């Protein structure tokens, strides 16, 4: 036989890590550099723009750290896009751009900067930064929070970053992780970035599947056929989506119905119930031994 590694001494010496580290959500080495403020700033809120790309959603929030918990000053979800004219395609690069633009315009509407700092309306994809206007309230600045997503070239986190920058958030960024930047010859192509923002990669793959075979076409894109999405409709649909986002960025919450107040969960067993259970198990074992013998 061999020695058991996980012994009582192992559980006595075992230190647990943090809860978000055990869940695998927070990179605390990155959070140590991100979230803390310099001590000579004296409770100046340090804003980070958090992007989390889920399987079916793109969460874009803006947070500043407090000691009880970092409060979300503004949030934007990808399922709000059917209100703006994007029925389907909620987890791609164009929806990341629209969610970042929606977060930016909603934050400027809540701060009262709708007319000032318009941003990019005729978006091409060039290197753009929000310059502060003199004699006006200053531009909002924040710093990007990707999290545990590996930041390679062509990431939806950087698509949401480009959406926030074009909506008018002064975020420092380089044109290296945006799609279009060639890794070999090292120059940035803005036309390829415009195609990825407006979604012509999805349209080209749609046309490629339509040329190849209808079965793999219907296997890959089903709700695009259900909601009548064609490649010629794609760029105009995202233009109307950008126009609707820049037109009405405010959010109305859903009305809450009175709760029926029932418990789907199974409640916790009490001490008297546990003491009764062990007594019934012992009595059942004794009467089974008496019945067998």
């Amino acid at each position: 036989f061999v020695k058991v590694v996980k012994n009582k001494a192992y559980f006595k010496r075992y230190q647990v890590k943090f809860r978000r580290r055990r869940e695998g959500k927070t990179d605390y080495y990155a959070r140590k550099r991100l979230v803390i403020q310099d001590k000579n700033k004296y409770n100046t809120p340090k804003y980070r723009m958090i992007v989390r790309v889920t399987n079916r959603d793109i969460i874009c929030q803006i947070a500043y750290a407090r000691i009880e918990g970092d409060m979300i000053v503004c949030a934007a979800y990808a399922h709000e896009l059917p209100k703006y004219g994007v029925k389907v395609g909620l987890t791609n690069y164009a929806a990341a751009y629209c969610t970042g633009l929606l977060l930016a315009r909603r934050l400027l509407n809540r701060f009262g900067m709708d007319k000032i700092y318009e941003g990019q309306v005729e978006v091409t994809g060039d290197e753009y930064n929000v310059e502060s206007i003199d004699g006006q309230p200053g531009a909002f600045t924040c710093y990007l929070d990707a999290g545990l997503a590996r930041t390679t070239t062509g990431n939806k986190v950087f698509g949401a970053l480009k959406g926030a920058v074009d909506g008018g958030l002064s975020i420092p960024h380089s044109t290296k992780r945006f799609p279009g930047y060639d890794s070999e010859s090292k120059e940035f192509n803005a036309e390829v970035h415009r195609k990825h923002i407006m979604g012509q990669n999805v349209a080209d793959y749609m046309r490629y599947l339509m040329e190849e075979d209808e079965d793999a076409y219907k296997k890959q894109f089903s709700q695009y056929i259900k909601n009548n999405v064609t490649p010629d409709m794609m760029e105009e649909m995202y233009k109307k989506a950008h126009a609707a986002i820049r037109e009405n960025p405010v959010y109305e919450k859903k009305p809450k119905r009175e709760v029926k107040k029932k418990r789907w969960n199974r409640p916790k067993m009490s001490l008297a119930q546990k003491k009764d259970r062990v007594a019934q198990k012992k009595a059942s074992f004794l009467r089974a031994q008496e019945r067998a013998a």
């Binding site: 198990k281 004794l286 031994q289």
Partner: protein, 205 residues
């Protein structure tokens, strides 16, 4: 040979054991710390007697060896070869030093390791003999003859416990009857109600 025990009779220094730092220590004479019939159960040797010290001193390993032989000989003469169990409950770890003078003198005076000695507290068991209930005055006589090998003064106390256990003799039979204790050789196993119920079913099945 070596020095008299009047020199290192009392606890003078810090406890200085054999370790990574203190190397080059000769082996102690006492190595077999129990004898008699140690391959035995708890039920067949009820009576237990202890040699309890009454001084905070240092008992040498050679004195432990001499008292072990002196108790062994009388227990073989009285109780036979398989009718007792002696246990020395003092393992000597304190490495004690020697300053041999062949002329340097007191300059650079730190001892080379001379031998081993056991740090003994007041009210601490030196030796312990478990035996049958008939052999009471024989164990008193054996411990009385073993007292002469040690310096100082120690008392002989016949314990209320059942052998080399921490449980009383009037309660031991009731606990074995209600299956709270299991005979496990020299020692005993105490089963609480804290474990899982599969252990309870394996006991009562």
């Amino acid at each position: 040979g070596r020095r008299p025990a009047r020199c290192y009779r009392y606890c003078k220094n810090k406890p200085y054991p054999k370790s990574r730092f203190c190397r080059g220590v000769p082996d102690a004479k006492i190595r077999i710390f129990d004898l008699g019939r140690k391959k035995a159960k708890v039920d067949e040797f009820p009576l237990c007697g202890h040699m309890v010290s009454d001084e905070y001193e240092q008992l040498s390993s050679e004195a432990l060896e001499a008292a072990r032989i002196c108790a062994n000989k009388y227990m073989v003469k009285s109780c036979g070869k398989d009718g007792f169990h002696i246990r020395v409950r003092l393992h000597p770890f304190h490495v004690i030093r020697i300053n041999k003078m062949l002329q340097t003198g007191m300059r650079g005076a730190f001892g080379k390791p001379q031998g081993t000695v056991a740090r003994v507290h007041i009210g601490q068991v030196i030796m312990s003999i478990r035996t049958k209930l008939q052999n009471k005055e024989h164990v008193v006589e054996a411990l009385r003859r073993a007292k002469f090998k040690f310096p100082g003064r120690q008392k002989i106390h016949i314990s209320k416990k059942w052998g080399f256990t921490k449980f009383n003799a009037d309660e031991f039979e009731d606990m074995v009857a209600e299956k709270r204790l299991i005979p496990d050789g020299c020692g005993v196993k105490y089963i609480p109600n804290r474990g899982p119920l599969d252990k309870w079913r394996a006991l009562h099945s």
